[PDB]
Design a protein around this nucleic acid. Structure first.
Lengths: 369, 369, 52, 369
RNA sequence: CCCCCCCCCCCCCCCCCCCCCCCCCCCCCCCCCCCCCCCCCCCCCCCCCCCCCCCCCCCCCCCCCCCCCC
């Protein structure tokens, strides 16, 4: 029977990758600092001092946000995440200590952290800039409120909201989503961009881009922190904003699956073409694979999971071209920089999707009605 | 088959969030006072003294109501709630002690509580104001009744009724439901607003708004206290009022689901439009998700649960516009400040819902009858 | 009632012109006119309601 | 039942027009010459003399061709045709006689016809021109053949072939098909355009246009002559050419019916639009009417039959626009000067018909396959 | 009002048939017994009963139709 001349390549590749009986273990290189719940207050203080500092220097904001996320997770869970990701990690204990230095010819008390990645001078200078900006702004408006201070419990979570936007745009492969990050961080968080002098979305976004590029394990740590944070029973409104912006990253890098479901929903006719119907077997194969994967598959492209390539639909040029055409016809493709590889099917689907709005729907009374 | 080109994104996101294998643990900052059953009588006395004090100062009423709720729960359950919500809490023991001070040049006996959040001066001044207001009102009417006193066992529960109204309106994101809280606290509790001189709904509502804004964990504590209180076998009539007002908050922030069920019930025709039928698959997805969640989902938006965004229907502009139009046509939309994002479907549904009252119903004898 | 519905449908489709006959059920006339107008922006209405 | 709210206007109009119990009888004005079989040879001689005359004057060729057709029919059938068409006719007997005149100072014998419409001078001058052209061409090539002479039995039938082309293009309402007539008379009849010096398609076509414009009863006579000629058991090859060119006129003025059948055959999707399906009832009404009419309906527009307007499809703007779009997309519309009255449906159908050639066909596996 | 475009057709190859073959052939008359049929008893019917009985005229309002475009 010709019906059994078939090969389930996607499922077989998945079974090969999921049934490996040997494991690799990478070496991060530089030692990882693992803060615990103890220093969460101090890291939040540092984030607040960065936020209240106008004309601020955000060169180190990405690392400080990563430290805050790791302190929220805790040392045990951070270590367990790093092992489960397949890393050899030098767990570095983080504890708070005092440092005494004379600036302006006056003895001064600073409370800093033992971070191998972040030197004492940097934290001291962050405090100095924050203090003098606070002095100037207190002079210019008289009395402060808990709104204008580093002691707010959500100062770190605003920075992590910026990180969540960066994560949403990470799947583009470079810093091309920086403009989108800035635009969305101006739409969202506009009250904060009033309230905090140093909340500069572009600088923080660039810092997080840099830290994610240099340390790929921080992407894994941040994704699992975001999943753990989104699994809480509740929280403040800033944590709700972070959860909403983080789940905006679910399915990033897999827009074609959603647009294919959309093209099925609007019932585009060019799904009835000969070549599309030729590829439909493996297309349904891919969709069933995505469903069997389920929730974990939504962050494959952000995490650079090796099995991300199994979810691709560009390996079916005709179906992909029809899907892109339908997306462009419905007016939702935007600046999507993926290009069709069957221009004719793309144009036909685009035209039909455009007439799907002036000419509402097409019946199929043809053929017996 | 084109029927298997589908993705269950809502369910996959829920499974991802519910199957997390790492947890975060937040730090509240300031220490939490955890009163036990021992001081419930004294906290109720404090609430009664606040209530019988005319022209009262309600700056601290929200914290005192929170303390009363936590004393009703007990220290064990309050601590367990705070852990289950994912908080690091400094459990502060609350016990009663005496303080002696000379006011009016006379030695005076006061019995106060060891609360870190509430200083002794504040409790002393509350007692002073209550005592002199009691003296003045006793002078002006001769003899008091158990109706006019702080020893009533429901004085704290009236304050918690005001808190329940504030909770009902918390999902609006700000203090825009203050007018509704005042109106409902005048409709309900009018006998009390006679009986108690200091029962000022606006001041207590503002105090509870402030305490819920500053301490997001108090929202969790109060919601679980309200659930535990509503699980009792019975109580007084004020506790019944509190239970009725608290379950008025169930489903807050999710009005569109109820209005969609309503639009299905009145059988609005614009549910048969092309785009609405395109979105119906994911709409049924969302409704099945809400049902699988069940009872716990009714307080997701009040608690700022991260999975609250999964219940949204505004991600389907056409269905949402039809639902808003049907609600506006039936005359129940009120001042709902959500706006349609398909004006045409909104207007069509509104018009049909309006003719659903003069022109009772429409048969579908068209097509074969 | 039927005449009013018919006039409303004619006016909604934009073909009634200066037809000087007038409806004697204004409500049905207006309802039919409105539905006929939405029959052009909102192409057709399915009846998936009731078992589909 | 709403299914019986229907009116069969086309069929009712046809029954009204076909069941009239009173008849009109028009008056042609000028007397009609009715030649019989006797003078067929002489009229064919006259046509041959016109054909062999180079640089000829074809002012009277249309009338001579009409006389030849009427002589082929016979006087009885010509009279019966004129009565059945509803005309009052002065039947004029045509017989041959001799006329003697002196040209070049020499007595000369001419044999002419008693035609009221055609004077003796005209026939004499036709003979003179033919004779001297024959003399010149005999001088220039030495000896003639039966190919180069007026005695050929098909000289009149070539002129009637030109008349048949003019009839094919008569439905355009004016002399706009003159270029098409000339082009087709050059493609066909090229051997004759060699063989006959005076076979000028444009002059003969203009003469036939003039005679058909002045005498509308000659259109009826010629159409019924062409039907009678095409009902013969056989004939020469020129008569076969005439029959082929005459049946090319069948269905002239009714191209939209054929193009609608074509759009049904290629299964254009825009036949499933809402408005097209609204009009399909009366469209099928018109097609059933055309079939009930049958063969006689193919010459309604040429004859200006009053019931020609009942076969129109432009009374259904959406279906007509779809049909024109399908015709233009398939590349067969040419210079058809009818214009769509729904531009959107026209463009949509044109686009789909164009993709019907690169994208062969579209399956309807959508909806359950 | 309607209509409006393009378009002659044809074109090759090809007689068919061809063999063998008379059919039949035997045996065989059919029938054969026994047997008339019927047979009893029995007229049928039988009573009671005329039918009907009331109430009730009917009706009553409003309303020309049409109107466009082609």
């Amino acid at each position: 029977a010709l019906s059994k001349v078939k090969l389930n390549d996607t499922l077989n590749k998945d079974q090969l990758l999921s049934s490996s009986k040997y494991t690799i273990q990478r070496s991060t290189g530089d030692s990882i600092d693992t803060p615990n719940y103890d220093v969460q207050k101090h890291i939040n203080k540092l984030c607040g001092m960065l936020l209240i500092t106008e004309d601020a220097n955000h060169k180190f904001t990405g690392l400080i946000g990563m430290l805050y996320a790791m302190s929220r997770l805790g040392r045990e869970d951070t270590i367990k995440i790093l092992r489960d990701a397949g890393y050899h990690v030098k767990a570095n204990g983080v504890d708070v200590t005092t440092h005494r230095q004379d600036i302006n010819g006056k003895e001064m008390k600073f409370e800093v952290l033992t971070l191998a990645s972040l030197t004492t001078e940097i934290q001291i200078n962050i405090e100095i800039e924050s203090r003098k900006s606070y002095k100037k702004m207190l002079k210019e408006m008289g009395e402060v409120a808990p709104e204008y201070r580093h002691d707010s419990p959500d100062c770190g979570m605003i920075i992590l909201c910026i990180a969540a936007l960066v994560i949403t745009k990470l799947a583009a492969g470079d810093r091309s989503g920086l403009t989108a990050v800035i635009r969305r961080a101006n739409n969202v968080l506009k009250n904060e961009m009033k309230r905090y002098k140093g909340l500069l979305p572009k600088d923080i976004a660039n810092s997080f881009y840099e830290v994610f590029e240099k340390h790929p394990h921080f992407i894994d740590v941040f994704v699992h922190f975001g999943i753990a944070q989104s699994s809480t029973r509740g929280g403040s409104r800033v944590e709700g904003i972070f959860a909403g912006l983080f789940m905006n990253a679910y399915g990033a890098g897999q827009v074609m699956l959603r647009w294919g479901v959309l093209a099925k929903s609007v019932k585009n006719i060019m799904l009835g073409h000969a070549s599309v119907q030729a590829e439909m077997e493996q297309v349904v194969e891919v969709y069933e694979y995505a469903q069997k994967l389920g929730g974990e598959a939504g962050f494959y492209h952000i995490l650079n999971n090796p099995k991300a390539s199994l979810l691709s639909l560009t390996q079916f040029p005709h179906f992909s071209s029809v899907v892109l055409g339908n997306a462009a016809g419905l007016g939702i493709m935007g600046e999507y920089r993926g290009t069709p590889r069957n221009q004719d099917l793309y144009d036909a689907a685009k035209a039909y999707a455009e007439q799907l709005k002036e000419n509402g729907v097409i019946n199929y009374s043809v053929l017996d009605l």
